[PDB]
Structure formats: C-alpha cells, structure tokens
C-alpha cells in the first residue's frame, strides 16, 4: 500500500532494457511492498531482454554511485501489455544534471569521503558532497511530488 509499488498483475510483459548511457546501470524493481530490489546491471551501450509484468515499477541508477538516471525521459518505467508480440523499450539515459551536481559526482568519484573536508572549497560544499544520491530518499521525494 505505499503509493509507489508494483501491482501483482501476474500478466507477462516482455521488456528490453537499453542502456543508452555511459554508466553501468542498476535496474531497480519496486516490489509489491514498494521496497527496491536490485537486478543485474547493464554495461554502457548494451541492451537486454527482461521478463517483467504489466503494472510493475522500475527505476534505474548508476550502479556504483546511485546517480539518478532516466528511462524514456522520466523517473519510473511501467511495462504495459505487449501489442502483437513487440516488447516495450526502456531507453535508459543520463538526465541533464546541474553543473553543480555533475561536479559533485566527479569530486566524489576521486576523493574518499573521509577526505572531503580536506578540500580547499567553500564550506557549504562539504555537506553537499556528503549528501550522496540515495534511492530511498528519491522514493520519498517522488512520493511527495506525486501527492502534490
């Protein structure tokens, strides 16, 4: 009964995950209690057929850093019934990050968290670095935005 969850439709829907990003992509399936479950990652520039179901919810993240990704240019992907045997594509891409977010990504990728506050940068940026992407937070955020 959380607002974001898969429905147990038990109706098969063949999907093709297409990783059109330069990241290693973690597909995240929201189970029937809305809890996120990881599925096998996709290397950059690769596609994979998936057996999923109508009304299941998926999101996608950078597997290493959980940076947000988009799927058909939105946050959540929901398989529909296949028309005439054609699978539904889930085209996974980078969003346009803010420059600030992109710089924080690069800095996080280079600097162990214990060493963030050894950087010679303006002090408000330490907490920005520390507040790394988090799927649970995103789910709470997407849930609020939905209500509104």
């Amino acid at each position: 009964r959380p607002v974001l969850r898969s429905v147990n439709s038990r109706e098969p829907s063949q999907v093709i995950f297409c990783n059109r990003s330069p990241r290693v992509v973690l597909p995240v399936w929201l189970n029937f209690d809305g809890e996120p479950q990881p599925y096998p990652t996709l290397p950059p520039g690769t596609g994979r057929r998936i057996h999923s179901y109508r009304g299941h919810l998926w999101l996608f993240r950078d597997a290493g850093t959980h940076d947000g990704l988009l799927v058909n240019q939105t946050e959540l992907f929901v398989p529909s019934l296949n028309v005439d045997g054609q699978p539904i594509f889930a085209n996974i891409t980078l969003p346009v990050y803010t420059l600030k977010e992109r710089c924080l990504q690069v800095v996080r990728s280079l600097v162990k968290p214990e060493n963030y506050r050894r950087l010679d940068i303006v002090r408000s940026l330490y907490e920005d670095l520390e507040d790394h992407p988090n799927v649970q937070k995103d789910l709470e955020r997407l849930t609020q935005e939905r209500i509104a």
């Binding site: 147990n8 059109r20 179901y53 299941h56």
Partner: peptide, 15 residues
C-alpha cells in the same frame, strides 16, 4: 502467488 521479474538466459546485445 507473487510473480517477480526475471531475465531469460540470453546474450546481451550491443546498441
């Protein structure tokens, strides 16, 4: 019964 996604044994393909 609850039916979760799964992945068929198959090669990935290049885009």
């Amino acid at each position: 019964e609850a039916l979760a996604p799964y992945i068929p044994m198959d090669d990935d393909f290049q885009l």
